[PDB]
Design a protein around this nucleic acid. Structure first.
Ligand SMILES: C[S@@+](CC[C@H](N)C(=O)[O-])C[C@H]1O[C@@H](n2cnc3c(N)ncnc32)[C@H](O)[C@@H]1O
Ligand SMILES: [Mg+2]
Ligand SMILES: [Mg+2]
Ligand SMILES: [Mg+2]
Ligand SMILES: [Mg+2]
Ligand SMILES: [Mg+2]
Ligand SMILES: [Mg+2]
Ligand SMILES: [Mg+2]
Ligand SMILES: [Mg+2]
Ligand SMILES: [Mg+2]
Ligand SMILES: [Mg+2]
Lengths: 140, 97, 55, 54, 95, 336
RNA sequence: CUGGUGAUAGCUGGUUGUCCAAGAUAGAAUCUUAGUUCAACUUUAAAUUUGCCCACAGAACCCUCUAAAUCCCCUUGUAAAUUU
RNA sequence: CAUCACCUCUAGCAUCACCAGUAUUAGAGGCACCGCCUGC
RNA sequence: AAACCUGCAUUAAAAAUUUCGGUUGGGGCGACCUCGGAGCAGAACCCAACCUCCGAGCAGUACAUGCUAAGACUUCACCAGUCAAAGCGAACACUCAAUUGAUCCAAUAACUUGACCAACGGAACAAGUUA
């Protein structure tokens, strides 16, 4: 039933195609170990706040990465203005950085390629973001 | 067994008269379901030797899932009725004598 | 509408059980007032015991 | 018994109360005195900055 | 108000009046002050003094409460050591 | 609800400030969206010596004292008797909430460290009379009283609601003996009247005109300047800044100094307003003023602040991730 | 279609002998302004004694000054007024 | 609107529809043939 | 061993009941609803809605800011609100124009406390649209 809930959450809650579900399980086996609540939050974060559709999530191996590093890199890019959240129509003012650039690239190289910020500045943001996230859990 | 109780008080009917039930008196609240209560042990008098006790006429207590399923249908045990105890008491008395 | 003050309850040290509510600054130590106790008909020491609400 | 127990507790507290009030009153003056003493110390320290100039 | 009950055919009493008001047999109605237990920390002692006292209703309110209660509440009672016993009759009242 | 005022404020800033700062705008934008670092301003009236020791235990460092010793190293000075403790660069640590001392007054005040520079740039001297326009809620007003160099003060802000907050701040921090006399005067009147009520009265004038506060606009949802109802006020906001600064300039005596401070990154409200007042005085009242150079001031505080070096007259402190103080713009102009 | 059902309608319409008598415009609250409740006004009965009209006297300084007047009100002319 | 054609989605199976059928099948849908061009 | 059934929980599906608070020619976008003051009825009181403009949803000092009690005021009703001699008890009716919220209910040994119920005399909890 642990496996059943994991796949059913992807198929029903996350509305993933059965073909897409098999690819995710084959490529990212950490999904089964991951908790259902954290996994569901990770998916909807990319779908709504980031604007990534279902086919891109499967192909980009998004679900395998840690949720925390996704928050740190995406929000920093969003606050930098390099990343634009798609509107209702789905259009973006500026082409958003590709998901492979954000996550697959190393932290030091990621800043140079897209963020264009020094290493020291990003370190302060993570501590700031962690405090905001910690207060977020306590507040909610 | 589902044991329920009425949310609303039922007015007293009197002596020799039936209570007047209202539409609101059909609202019940669950008090206790007897299926979720701790089990009890059935008291039986053994007739033939068993793994737990091998002495005929020795009163034993086991789970109701064993006496009802195995001991009683197979004739291994009998109910611990007071009359049965008196009959087996005489049988034990003859053994001592 | 920041809560600068809080409502506290002062309990008499005379053992009569008489208590009254007073307003004090949140950023302050526990008060020890000298209030009139009707039970003993004289002024007695009072001590803050529990905060009621934040004003 | 409940009336007597409450009455005895009131009497016991009232016995220690005059000393408690005096101690509480004394503590108020001591804190006020120490704060007053620090004000004198700061005035000397503030004067020292002007003293170095002159 | 139920002027005729469905089972006895007689006038009923509104229980919201019995739990709030007291009727002196002379005809007066005694009530409490609205808010004598609410936010006492922000009220002056003079204001609280006149809040924890019992007052009388006026002509219109007393007439209203008489129609909302039956005769069982307008009868003369003889409770032993009743706090309001001496208030059931008017003294030296003219017109 | 409906359209968030935060997004409307961010949209207006994004178009305007991208051109002005270029590649620096992404760095500024993150700092603006992040929480600003709070500096601890020790109350001189309270146990300043004890609190200074207490803050040093929390790894806080007095940058003002460090900046004092740097005046001789680099080779009007600045307002003395100011002690503000901040953390190291890149430290997100927050100060504990302030507490009353043995004297009954709060030991220190938490405020932006970039807001102290207009007080520092004012170059306050003992025995002077200080006029502060839009003094409420008292961020700069408290610092002036901490110095003790102002015998007479006039704190005027148009909004009585802001003024009432200022008096409570003064009561909690400033002892009543100073406030008892006519030393501190608190009024709620238009600052444009001060150019006629009291001319040449004050030697030091600090004019912090109302403006779109970038830090507050992007976070606060109440009374935002960028909401639809406040659009008319925002359009006439540059007009008010020119009139209020001009009134403060006329209020000072010749030979005095006036510091114009603004909490925004908009050039239309920082440099254009300064130039507008200078032209306005000459055309209508024939008044000439000289803007002093703040480059020497900048080089001392470069360690603890980030500065934008493309300003015509004033000095602009831009927010940064490591140094979140700002945004703050201040220009010191003296009357001749 | 029948029944609940004589559903409900702050809405529209209607409301049937004779004669006489007294009788119109302050407001407040309200999911309220097409309504209702209280007050005012009006009616009847009762009780009581003053009611109206009004001679002086009297009713704030301000922001510098400034209207017709109003309140109160003994006499007097009158017969009402208050209360239940 | 439907329409061949194309496309998406779901389903590995029987004794009352689908079906006395079995993924070259069945169902739920989009679009409206074909031909050319294009995404990936 | 396993299933079915039953009871109780947890998601989801599909449904079920109910409602669209007022003010501003209409719509859009916004503002407004309570309390205090002014233009505002020049002289007892009251009274100009809509409108124009500025505020208030506090804070501070007390800790007898205790307890009782004649006579009055009153925002045109009610609710609510306001002043107060004397007296007991102490000492030798706090400032402030507004600075506020009923009942039920909940918590508590008692005392007492709880709503931007701000649609501010307050429905325990309900949107949009119909060409
Ligand atoms: C951006 S705040 C600056 C506050 C203060 N100077 C500080 O930094 O701590 C500007 C304030 O000026 C006030 N203000 C607006 N218009 C004014 C005017 N015309 N005359 C005087 N003050 C005004 C506003 O109430 C506003 O709170
Ligand atoms: Mg009977
Ligand atoms: Mg009808
Ligand atoms: Mg109606
Ligand atoms: Mg007639
Ligand atoms: Mg078609
Ligand atoms: Mg009245
Ligand atoms: Mg309402
Ligand atoms: Mg209302
Ligand atoms: Mg009212
Ligand atoms: Mg049509």
């Amino acid at each position: 039933q642990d496996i059943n809930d994991t796949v059913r959450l992807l198929k029903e809650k996350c509305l993933f195609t059965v073909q897409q579900v098999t690819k995710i399980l084959h490529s990212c086996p950490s999904v089964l170990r991951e908790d259902l609540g954290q996994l569901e939050y990770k998916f909807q974060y990319a779908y709504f706040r980031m604007g990534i559709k279902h086919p891109d999530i499967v192909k980009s191996e998004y679900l395998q990465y840690s949720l925390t590093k996704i928050k740190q890199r995406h929000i920093y890019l969003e606050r930098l203005g390099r990343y634009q959240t798609p509107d209702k129509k789905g259009q973006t003012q500026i082409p958003n950085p590709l998901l492979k650039d954000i996550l697959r690239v190393s932290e030091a190289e990621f800043l140079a390629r897209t963020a264009c910020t020094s290493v020291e500045e990003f370190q302060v943001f993570k501590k700031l973001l962690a405090r905001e996230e910690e207060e977020s859990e306590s507040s909610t | 067994t589902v044991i329920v109780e009425r949310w609303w008080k039922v007015p007293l009917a009197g002596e020799g008269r039936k209570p007047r039930l209202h539409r609101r008196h059909r609202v019940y609240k669950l008090v206790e379901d007897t299926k979720h209560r701790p089990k009890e042990n059935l008291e039986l008098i053994l007739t033939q030797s068993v793994e737990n006790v091998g002495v005929r006429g020795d009163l034993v207590s086991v789970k109701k899932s064993l006496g009802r399923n195995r001991l009683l249908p197979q004739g291994l045990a009998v109910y611990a009725s007071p009359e049965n105890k008196k009959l087996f008491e005489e049988e034990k008395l003859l053994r001592q004598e | 509408s920041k809560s600068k003050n809080i409502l506290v309850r002062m309990v008499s040290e005379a053992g009569t059980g008489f208590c009254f509510n007073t307003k004090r600054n949140r950023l302050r130590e526990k008060l020890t007032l000298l209030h009139y106790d009707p039970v003993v008909k004289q002024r007695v020491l009072f001590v803050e015991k529990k905060k009621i609400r934040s004003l | 018994q409940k009336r007597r127990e409450r009455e005895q507790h009131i009497a016991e507290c009232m016995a220690k109360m005059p000393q408690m009030i005096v101690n509480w009153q004394q503590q108020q003056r001591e804190n006020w005195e120490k704060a007053q003493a620090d004000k004198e110390r700061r005035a000397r320290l503030q004067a020292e900055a002007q003293e170095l100039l002159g | 108000l139920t002027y005729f009950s469905a089972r006895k055919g007689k006038r009923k009493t509104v229980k919201a009046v019995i739990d709030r008001f007291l009727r002196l047999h002379c005809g007066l109605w005694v009530r409490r002050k609205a808010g004598y237990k609410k936010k006492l920390w922000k009220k002056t002692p003079a204001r609280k003094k006149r809040l924890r006292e019992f007052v009388f209703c006026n002509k219109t309110q007393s007439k209203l409460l008489d129609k909302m209660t039956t005769s069982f509440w307008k009868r003369r009672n003889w409770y032993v050591d009743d706090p309001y016993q001496k208030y059931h009759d008017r003294t030296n009242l003219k017109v | 609800p409906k359209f968030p005022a935060v997004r409307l404020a961010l949209q207006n800033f994004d178009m305007t400030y991208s051109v002005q700062f270029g590649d620096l705008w992404p760095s500024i934008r993150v700092s603006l969206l992040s929480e600003q670092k709070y500096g601890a301003l020790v109350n001189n009236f309270a146990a300043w010596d004890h609190v200074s020791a207490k803050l040093e235990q929390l790894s806080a460092k007095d940058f003002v004292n460090e900046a004092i010793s740097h005046w001789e190293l680099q080779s009007w000075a600045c307002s003395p008797n100011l002690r503000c403790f901040t953390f190291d660069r890149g430290d997100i640590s927050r100060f504990p909430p302030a507490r009353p001392g043995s004297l009954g007054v709060m030991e220190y005040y938490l405020m932006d460290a970039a807001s102290l520079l207009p007080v520092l740039a004012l170059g306050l001297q003992p025995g002077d009379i200080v006029l502060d326009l839009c003094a409420a809620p008292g961020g700069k007003t408290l610092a002036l009283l901490q110095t003790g160099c102002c015998r007479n003060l006039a704190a005027n802000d148009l909004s009585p609601s802001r003024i009432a907050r200022l008096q409570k701040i003064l009561h909690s921090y400033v002892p009543e003996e100073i406030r008892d006399g006519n030393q501190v005067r608190v009024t709620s009147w238009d600052g444009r009247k001060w150019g006629e009520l009291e001319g040449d009265t004050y030697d030091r004038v600090l004019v912090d005109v109302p403006c779109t506060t970038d830090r507050h606009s992007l976070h606060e949802e109440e009374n935002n300047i960028f909401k639809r109802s406040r659009k008319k006020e925002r359009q006439i906001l540059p007009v008010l800044q020119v009139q209020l600064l001009a009134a403060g300039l006329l209020a000072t005596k010749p030979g005095g100094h006036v510091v114009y401070s603004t909490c925004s990154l908009s050039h239309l409200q920082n440099e254009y307003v300064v130039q507008g007042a200078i032209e306005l005085l000459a055309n209508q009242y024939s008044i000439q003023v000289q803007v002093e150079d703040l480059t020497h001031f900048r080089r001392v505080f470069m360690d603890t602040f980030c500065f934008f070096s493309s300003c015509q007259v004033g000095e602009l402190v831009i927010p940064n991730l490591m140094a979140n103080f700002g945004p703050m713009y201040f220009c010191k102009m003296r009357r001749l």
